[PDB]
Amino acid sequence: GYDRHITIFSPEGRLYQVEYAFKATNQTNINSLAVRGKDCTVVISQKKVPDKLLDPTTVSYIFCISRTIGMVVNGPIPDARNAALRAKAEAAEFRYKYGYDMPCDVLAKRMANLSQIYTQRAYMRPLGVILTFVSVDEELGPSIYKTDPAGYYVGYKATATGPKQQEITTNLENHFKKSKIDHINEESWEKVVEFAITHMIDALGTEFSKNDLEVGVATKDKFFTLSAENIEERLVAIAEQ
Amino acid sequence: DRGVSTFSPEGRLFQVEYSLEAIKLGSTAIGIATKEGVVLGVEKRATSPLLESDSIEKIVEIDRHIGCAMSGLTADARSMIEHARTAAVTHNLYYDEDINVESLTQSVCDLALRFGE
Amino acid sequence: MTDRYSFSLTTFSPSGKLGQIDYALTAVKQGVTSLGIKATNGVVIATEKKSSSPLAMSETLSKVSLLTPDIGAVYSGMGPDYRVLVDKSRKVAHTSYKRIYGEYPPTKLLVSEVAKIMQEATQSGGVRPFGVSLLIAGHDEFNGFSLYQVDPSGSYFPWKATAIGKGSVAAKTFLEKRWNDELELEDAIHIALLTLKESVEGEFNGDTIELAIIGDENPDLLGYTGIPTDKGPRFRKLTSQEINDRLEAL
Amino acid sequence: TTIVGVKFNNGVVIAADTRSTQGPIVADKNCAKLHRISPKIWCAGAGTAADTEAVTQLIGSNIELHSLYTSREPRVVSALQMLKQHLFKYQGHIGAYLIVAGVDPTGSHLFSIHAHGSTDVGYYLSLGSGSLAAMAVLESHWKQDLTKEEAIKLASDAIQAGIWNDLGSGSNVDVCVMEIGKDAEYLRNYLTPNVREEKQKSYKFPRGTTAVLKESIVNICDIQEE
Amino acid sequence: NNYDGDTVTFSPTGRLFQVEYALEAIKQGSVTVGLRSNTHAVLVALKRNADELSSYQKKIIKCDEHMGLSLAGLAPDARVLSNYLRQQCNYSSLVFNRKLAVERAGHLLCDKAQKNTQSYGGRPYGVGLLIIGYDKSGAHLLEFQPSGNVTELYGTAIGARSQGAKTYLERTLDTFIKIDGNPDELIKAGVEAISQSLRDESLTVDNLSIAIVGKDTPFTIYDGEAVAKYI
Amino acid sequence: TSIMAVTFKDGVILGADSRTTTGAYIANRVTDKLTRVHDKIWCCRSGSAADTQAIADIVQYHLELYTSQYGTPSTETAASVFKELCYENKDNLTAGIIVAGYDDKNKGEVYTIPLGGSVHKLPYAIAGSGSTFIYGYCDKNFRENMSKEETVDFIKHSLSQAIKWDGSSGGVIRMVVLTAAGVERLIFYPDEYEQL
Amino acid sequence: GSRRYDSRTTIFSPEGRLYQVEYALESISHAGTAIGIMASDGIVLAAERKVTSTLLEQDTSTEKLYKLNDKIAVAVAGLTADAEILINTARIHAQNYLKTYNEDIPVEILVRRLSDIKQGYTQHGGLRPFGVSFIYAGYDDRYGYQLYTSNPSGNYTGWKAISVGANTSAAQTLLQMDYKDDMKVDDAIELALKTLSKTTDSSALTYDRLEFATIRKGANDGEVYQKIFKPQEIKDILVKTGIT
Amino acid sequence: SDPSSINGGIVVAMTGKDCVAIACDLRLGSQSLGVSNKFEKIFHYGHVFLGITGLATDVTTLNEMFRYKTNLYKLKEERAIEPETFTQLVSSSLYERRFGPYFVGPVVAGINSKSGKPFIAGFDLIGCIDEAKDFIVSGTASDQLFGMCESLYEPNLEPEDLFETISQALLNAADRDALSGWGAVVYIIKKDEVVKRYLKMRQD
Amino acid sequence: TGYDLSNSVFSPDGRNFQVEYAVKAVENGTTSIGIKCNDGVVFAVEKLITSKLLVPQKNVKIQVVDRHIGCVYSGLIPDGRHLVNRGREEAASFKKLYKTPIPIPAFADRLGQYVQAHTLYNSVRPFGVSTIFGGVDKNGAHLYMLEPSGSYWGYKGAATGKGRQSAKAELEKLVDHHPEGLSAREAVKQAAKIIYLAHEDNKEKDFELEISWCSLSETNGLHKFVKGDLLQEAIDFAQKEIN
Numbered sequence A: 001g002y003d004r005h006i007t008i009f010s011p012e013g014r015l016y017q018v019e020y021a022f023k024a025t026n027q028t029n030i031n032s033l034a035v036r037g038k039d040c041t042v043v044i045s046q047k048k049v050p051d052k053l054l055d056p057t058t059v060s061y062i063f064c065i066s067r068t069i070g071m072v073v074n075g076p077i078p079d080a081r082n083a084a085l086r087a088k089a090e091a092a093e094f095r096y097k098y099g100y101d102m103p104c105d106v107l108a109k110r111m112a113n114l115s116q117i118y119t120q121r122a123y124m125r126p127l128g129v130i131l132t133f134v135s136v137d138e139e140l141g142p143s144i145y146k147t148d149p150a151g152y153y154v155g156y157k158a159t160a161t162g163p164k165q166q167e168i169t170t171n172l173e174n175h176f177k178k179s180k181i182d183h184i185n186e187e188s189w190e191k192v193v194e195f196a197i198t199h200m201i202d203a204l205g206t207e208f209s210k211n212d213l214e215v216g217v218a219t220k221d222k223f224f225t226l227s228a229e230n231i232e233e234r235l236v237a238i239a240e241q
Numbered sequence B: 001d002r003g004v005s006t007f008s009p010e011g012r013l014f015q016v017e018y019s020l021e022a023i024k025l026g027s028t029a030i031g032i033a034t035k036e037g038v039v040l041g042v043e044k045r046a047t048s049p050l051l052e053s054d055s056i057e058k059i060v061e062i063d064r065h066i067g068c069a070m071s072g073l074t075a076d077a078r079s080m081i082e083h084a085r086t087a088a089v090t091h092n093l094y095y096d097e098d099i100n101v102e103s104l105t106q107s108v109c110d111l112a113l114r115f116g117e
Numbered sequence C: 001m002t003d004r005y006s007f008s009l010t011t012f013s014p015s016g017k018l019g020q021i022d023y024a025l026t027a028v029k030q031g032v033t034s035l036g037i038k039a040t041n042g043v044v045i046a047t048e049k050k051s052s053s054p055l056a057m058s059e060t061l062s063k064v065s066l067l068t069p070d071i072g073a074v075y076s077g078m079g080p081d082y083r084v085l086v087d088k089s090r091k092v093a094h095t096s097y098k099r100i101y102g103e104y105p106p107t108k109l110l111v112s113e114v115a116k117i118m119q120e121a122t123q124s125g126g127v128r129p130f131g132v133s134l135l136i137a138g139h140d141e142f143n144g145f146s147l148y149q150v151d152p153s154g155s156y157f158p159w160k161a162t163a164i165g166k167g168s169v170a171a172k173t174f175l176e177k178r179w180n181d182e183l184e185l186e187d188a189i190h191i192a193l194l195t196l197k198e199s200v201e202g203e204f205n206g207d208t209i210e211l212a213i214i215g216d217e218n219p220d221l222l223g224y225t226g227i228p229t230d231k232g233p234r235f236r237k238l239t240s241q242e243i244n245d246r247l248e249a250l
Numbered sequence D: 001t002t003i004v005g006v007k008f009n010n011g012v013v014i015a016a017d018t019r020s021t022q023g024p025i026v027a028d029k030n031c032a033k034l035h036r037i038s039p040k041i042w043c044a045g046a047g048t049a050a051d052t053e054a055v056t057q058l059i060g061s062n063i064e065l066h067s068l069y070t071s072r073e074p075r076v077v078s079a080l081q082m083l084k085q086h087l088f089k090y091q092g093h094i095g096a097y098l099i100v101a102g103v104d105p106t107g108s109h110l111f112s113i114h115a116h117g118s119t120d121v122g123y124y125l126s127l128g129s130g131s132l133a134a135m136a137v138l139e140s141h142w143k144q145d146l147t148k149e150e151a152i153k154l155a156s157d158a159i160q161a162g163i164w165n166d167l168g169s170g171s172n173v174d175v176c177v178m179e180i181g182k183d184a185e186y187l188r189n190y191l192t193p194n195v196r197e198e199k200q201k202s203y204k205f206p207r208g209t210t211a212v213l214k215e216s217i218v219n220i221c222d223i224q225e226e
Numbered sequence E: 001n002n003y004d005g006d007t008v009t010f011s012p013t014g015r016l017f018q019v020e021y022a023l024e025a026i027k028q029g030s031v032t033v034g035l036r037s038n039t040h041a042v043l044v045a046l047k048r049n050a051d052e053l054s055s056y057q058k059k060i061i062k063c064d065e066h067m068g069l070s071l072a073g074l075a076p077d078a079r080v081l082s083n084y085l086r087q088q089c090n091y092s093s094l095v096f097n098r099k100l101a102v103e104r105a106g107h108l109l110c111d112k113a114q115k116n117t118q119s120y121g122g123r124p125y126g127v128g129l130l131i132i133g134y135d136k137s138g139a140h141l142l143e144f145q146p147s148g149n150v151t152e153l154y155g156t157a158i159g160a161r162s163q164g165a166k167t168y169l170e171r172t173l174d175t176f177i178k179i180d181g182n183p184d185e186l187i188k189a190g191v192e193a194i195s196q197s198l199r200d201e202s203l204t205v206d207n208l209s210i211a212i213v214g215k216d217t218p219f220t221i222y223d224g225e226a227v228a229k230y231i
Numbered sequence F: 001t002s003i004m005a006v007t008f009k010d011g012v013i014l015g016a017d018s019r020t021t022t023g024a025y026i027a028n029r030v031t032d033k034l035t036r037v038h039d040k041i042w043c044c045r046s047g048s049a050a051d052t053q054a055i056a057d058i059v060q061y062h063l064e065l066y067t068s069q070y071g072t073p074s075t076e077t078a079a080s081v082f083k084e085l086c087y088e089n090k091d092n093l094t095a096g097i098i099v100a101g102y103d104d105k106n107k108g109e110v111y112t113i114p115l116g117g118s119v120h121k122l123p124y125a126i127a128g129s130g131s132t133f134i135y136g137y138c139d140k141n142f143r144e145n146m147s148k149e150e151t152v153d154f155i156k157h158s159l160s161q162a163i164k165w166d167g168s169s170g171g172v173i174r175m176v177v178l179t180a181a182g183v184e185r186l187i188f189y190p191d192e193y194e195q196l
Numbered sequence G: 001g002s003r004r005y006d007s008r009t010t011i012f013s014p015e016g017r018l019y020q021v022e023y024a025l026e027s028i029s030h031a032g033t034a035i036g037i038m039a040s041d042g043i044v045l046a047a048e049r050k051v052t053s054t055l056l057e058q059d060t061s062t063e064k065l066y067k068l069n070d071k072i073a074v075a076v077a078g079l080t081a082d083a084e085i086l087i088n089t090a091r092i093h094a095q096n097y098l099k100t101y102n103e104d105i106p107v108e109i110l111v112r113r114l115s116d117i118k119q120g121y122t123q124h125g126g127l128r129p130f131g132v133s134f135i136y137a138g139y140d141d142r143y144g145y146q147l148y149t150s151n152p153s154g155n156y157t158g159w160k161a162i163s164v165g166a167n168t169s170a171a172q173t174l175l176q177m178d179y180k181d182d183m184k185v186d187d188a189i190e191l192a193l194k195t196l197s198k199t200t201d202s203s204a205l206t207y208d209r210l211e212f213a214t215i216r217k218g219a220n221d222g223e224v225y226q227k228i229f230k231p232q233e234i235k236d237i238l239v240k241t242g243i244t
Numbered sequence H: 001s002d003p004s005s006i007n008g009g010i011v012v013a014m015t016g017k018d019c020v021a022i023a024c025d026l027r028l029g030s031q032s033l034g035v036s037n038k039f040e041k042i043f044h045y046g047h048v049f050l051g052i053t054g055l056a057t058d059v060t061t062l063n064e065m066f067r068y069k070t071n072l073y074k075l076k077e078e079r080a081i082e083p084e085t086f087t088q089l090v091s092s093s094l095y096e097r098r099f100g101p102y103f104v105g106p107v108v109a110g111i112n113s114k115s116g117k118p119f120i121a122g123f124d125l126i127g128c129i130d131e132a133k134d135f136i137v138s139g140t141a142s143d144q145l146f147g148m149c150e151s152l153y154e155p156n157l158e159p160e161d162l163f164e165t166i167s168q169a170l171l172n173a174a175d176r177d178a179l180s181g182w183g184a185v186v187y188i189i190k191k192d193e194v195v196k197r198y199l200k201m202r203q204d
Numbered sequence I: 001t002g003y004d005l006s007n008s009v010f011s012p013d014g015r016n017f018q019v020e021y022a023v024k025a026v027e028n029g030t031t032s033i034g035i036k037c038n039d040g041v042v043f044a045v046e047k048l049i050t051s052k053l054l055v056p057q058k059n060v061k062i063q064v065v066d067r068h069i070g071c072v073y074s075g076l077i078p079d080g081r082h083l084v085n086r087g088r089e090e091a092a093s094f095k096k097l098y099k100t101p102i103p104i105p106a107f108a109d110r111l112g113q114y115v116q117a118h119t120l121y122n123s124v125r126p127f128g129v130s131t132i133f134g135g136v137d138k139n140g141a142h143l144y145m146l147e148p149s150g151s152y153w154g155y156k157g158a159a160t161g162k163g164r165q166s167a168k169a170e171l172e173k174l175v176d177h178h179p180e181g182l183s184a185r186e187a188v189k190q191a192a193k194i195i196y197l198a199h200e201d202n203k204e205k206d207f208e209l210e211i212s213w214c215s216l217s218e219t220n221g222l223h224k225f226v227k228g229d230l231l232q233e234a235i236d237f238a239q240k241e242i243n
């Protein structure tokens, strides 16, 4: 039974190492969510600092890949940082060679192709991570593209990742069935973040303090992460209506 | 299977210990050192009477002042002899002298553990 | 480090079977149904856009891909494997042909190059076979219209019409009854939509179906005027609306 | 060689002459110096003929594969970057002097590239042996906010200046117009001011004039059946 | 058990069995003792013969004028490592006109042994070394293990029955450290130390091997009738 | 070419002419020799246009990758990357570069990198063929902690003279102002600066 | 490390057989039968396509018979993809020889080169062998008309008549019975088809299930012509010989 | 010293009405010394004709190279190569030796078997294509050939007339060049018949 | 089963058992700690005295990287040395290209990526060490801890080895009782105490204390070893607290 140790086909036409890499994805026990506004793309993720000895400012699963592209990871931090460093390198090289900023979907495809290689080549293991890339593309507008250990990737209206992804997914599905549009009809990104947090609260059934969340926002020509105090202001506005 | 350069639990290299068993199956060779000279003798051990025994070469010259006898898988010795002869002649070229018997032996033994994967 | 897997991971078993190729074909069997039909004045290729989530934008995922202006491809099996094959196929069409002869390769020779890449993954060191079967439709001046299937082994066969993946056995039977040598392109598209409806469970419309044709030259899609000999690509992907129009006359 | 590029209201136009030389001899009277990199990105080339063609085909090939990879229409800055990096790498030994122009999702663009890898931006440019004759015209008549019709006129006038005044340039005028939101129109032989006059005499010989030694049929066909 | 096939494999309790098996080869080897004072450092080695016709295997190797070691285990591996030290000592002299520090010599051996324990294909070294030397910070004694661990000591012993000599030195610690400006008395203490590891056999003229380095004493090896004085 | 960079109270200002020559022919009369390698780190280019462009393109790539990993780089760090390229490839390059940038901590800084690949941190720097004619003028007229308006006048007057005497220099005078306020581009035409 | 997953494709069994070669031969025994018959005035190559479909485009199809050069052709039995790798190598070798010596490559030399490549995969490299057996039909001015076969072991032999693929035991017996030395091409054509017709696993032998080719000096004067038969031409020769 | 003028030689090609013609001299020399008077410079791969001038070793080498490549093309494509396609193959093959080129001046001539359109083309030693409607010239007497062709040539000549025009162009050009001559061959090419004529010329 | 025999193999859980076995080697090692203070960091380690024959203060465990970073580790000592050698190469190339000394977060990822790379292939073994490291840069003081998996985070206090639980408890008290912060000289005293308290888990053999520190005020942002009177002062403070 060595067909379960390396990335070769089983008799059922399955790749067990790829399937087990999907299971490593939920090892951190963190849930993430991404949604699109009119002018922006918002990504939120649970933040858990169990140890008091930890410096909470360094605990993060959201990455600034380029000025325009942000990436949230679902999976162990070593593999997460591996993917982040590579994506940063690829994004920089793209700009140098082709003279314009790498689009979100193109980076996603590139990382997906790299992941595909690990599913075909034996000496390389898959990374146990799911990469969610977000930006406001200059052609396609607000964009969410997600990659997994199988090498699969696709664009999204909205998306969710983690142990309780299905609860979040259905919650978002039901909202877009009502509104009958592919995004959050809202002008400011602040209110889109408020929507994202509100619908995660409803889906998970848990309340959040300022230190329980982590937020990333993509606007035209820049991606940035919110501080604890920026999130607190967001939580106050939600509670007051 | 298992590594070629693997240690046993007793602290011995499996492959080295197994090669020693192959040498025990080989034909006998004897050497005696005296103050008047060193004598080397071997058992030829022909597998059949039709085999011309004088073609069995188990005693071999390395240089004018160094000889060699072998026992075991004798085909393996050819590259060792070639190295020894080259080492002996090369040293004479570099230093205009005969090479010490110990130094020659050390050069041959350096090849021994150059095996792996 | 170093790739120390320099040995074959696909080997003959006592019965003469190449296990990894068989298992790759099993992965293709599980894949979504895709088909191809050849007409007198064109070729059609089609498949279902099996969306993994309703939040996912299925337009961003292209199962039917342009390889050259006159050649297209569709698959069944593992999507990621297909994606990299298309990248390699597009590149080899340039490096091993267009940069030499100054023109795009004929269908059969591009298929031959793709087949070669898939064969090498079946024999080279430290790799598994590709878990896909391709259907490649195309046109060229001297061979006319043509449709080829390519398997994980690297084997390829030309077809008048065929289907691969989930419900291929039933779909091939359906095509045998309907196919003839006097079919026009519109008739082939009609038959393609009928055949594909049998294997689809849920929604059946322009948004859940992906369909492209190799037909007449499209000067409107060329992007420039001023060269009479350049008349445009024969490959065209049908729009969501264009599919729905033909579903009313179904 | 005279090649020019002129920007206008809603796009860009490039033009070129059609002479190819081998020292003082004319090798081709109707040479095509306007190359297509992609459908809406065209470049005009001066210098070593084989180099401008090869470097344009290579970058055009890689631009096509890039456009397929990214699912986007190619940009002029991409062709510009790929070209200059290629030419810089060969330290000027690939003698290609190009004027790259086109329209893309970002807008209309006009650049020049030299064999050593330097790029320049402008509203009007000219390269080649007739670039001084052409630039004299451009500097005299160019203005901001040109119409398409005014730009084509300026560009072809600039090429004519090279054709008449430069011995390295001659014959006809080729043009390519790349307007925003439109197909690019390649106007091969837009002007033909150098048609040869009728010859005074016909030099058609009487059949049998030339002395022959042998005749034979050449077998071009394959090996035959039966 | 299942985790001793190669060096690249941890066991479930976090052990490296191939390294431990290499450590076992040292215990099978003949005893050797190392000790030092503030002025001198001494190596004493019990050489082993194959039989009565054979010679006694050499245990001590010179690395430089101010440094050398004694071995216990696979002798060819000691030749590889001593050759490496010779080169490193030599690189330091040629490039920096600087005698290599004994502590830095230990660090280099550690890092060389380590690479063999983390990579596939190779194997750990099957030998233990006792390095003595005199540098700018006085006399030194090091103990090298092929796991990579190198340790600076006042005295020590490795090989078969080495625990007896190691206990003696642990008692004598306060005495032999004070033996300054007296090489013969420091060797006497080393010969008396190695004697605690002997059974059946005793120290003969072609059995014993001694080496010394110090303040105004280059690394020199004593064999044959040169050590009869100390028997 | 006439290029210069001058530190002052609020930050630093880069200045340059706009002439590119091929012998005595002016291949480009509206060249932009002030190029951006990072938000508030710019450079002035002199020498080969191909070499200086290729270098600046690589540096921009390095600092973009630096920023993605370690955050905003210092002006000294940018100068070091330029240096490493110019020094290690000195046999094959002809590039005289001035690096200038603004930090909040270090404020305005100027580093000049001549042909050899050596680095020199200075209060102000001048370079290019036309710089030779204004060494005397710039040394006599430079002061530390000048105002923005004073510094603009200093650069404008200096480059005006460099343009006047050097045939390889001319066209418009471009300037780039780097302060905490942001990045301001300036331009001065012949009719303005010739009458000075 | 990686040793754990190595099949060791190039080793001997205790009996002194090459495992992978033997298993590759087992694979080939399930492939469509291919027959080669050598006559005094030419060579015949016949081969059976494997369970085809009515929707297979036959006239543009090629899975069995391939052209190496103008004088030499091959019939394939085994993995088609593996065969095409070797075929392209053989085509190149023939052109290298022609460029070097300005003469068409002798048949045996080409066969030996391909057979040596196959041998290499059984002795070194750790890769699986090619699961292919060839029948070489060719002509040169030294030995005239020649038939050879090669298999995954890299061993090759010359033949008057030979079969590869499925049911070779039955096919070889039938050929051994009716073959004679003074035989001609037209007779050899009939023998090849009659042998396939009896050994086939199909119910009946039809034009759409066959690939056929001849190498004849039946070309205008001293020269050799290769004829790859078209579907309609195979249909006609089936009627002529009296099989359909 | 100059590689392109050690051996000497010329090639010329012309188009006519539903026909093309290609011609060459037969001289091969070592500078002043004439060595061979049977050194033909025109070759054919199926129905596509290639004339090559320049350094004789490279002429021989390139013929063997294009024979190699066209034979493989045919095996894979299952059809003979066309002039338009072969022209691109020559350009590709020459430019791959950009910084160590073959010192040759190729000329392609033929008729497209599908369209029936006559086709000629010329190249420089590194690949540049000159696809002329009227005529192509190459060799040590290319200046002479340009002058003859540019005056003698008229469009839409019948095969038997075209033969006279191209033959006189070659002969009179070669007689003004010291390194060309020693015989001549003319190919007249129609869609399905090709005639080859050796000309009688002065042997000095 | 068999998933734990080879490195870089996912088990059906999604775990890399070989990395988890490397952690066992770390847990077997001596105790080492790190304390982040007001303007710097303090490192301390437990050195087991196996024998009287060990020369005091000679077998130094804590290692410097560049001139501003300190590194200490528990587990397989040679593996730690290998990691520090790489760290020194990474720091050298950074300073070579970018001029400035490598920032601590930048340095942390260099080690992190390198350790993580040793979980990607079966041809290499994971690192048998958890490394505590940090120092002072332009942005201030930073303390990090890096595991065999390549996982690392920033820390206020860090501890690893056989006495990590005892140490962690002591560090947690300091974080609670000093929200405004701890001074560099205080941190040295506390570091000594924590090692002495953590020595109850290795109480068979006696031990030797070794401390180092980087501080903006006390050491000018350079890594230095605590020696002589300041070391003895910390030992006395530690001995007083256990009694």
Ligand SMILES: [Cl-]
Binding pocket: A109, A110, A113, A114
């Ligand atoms: Cl890719």
Ligand SMILES: [Cl-]
Binding pocket: D118, D119, F020, F031, F032, F033, F049, F053
């Ligand atoms: Cl510039």
Ligand SMILES: [Mg+2]
Binding pocket: H203, H204
């Ligand atoms: Mg003469």
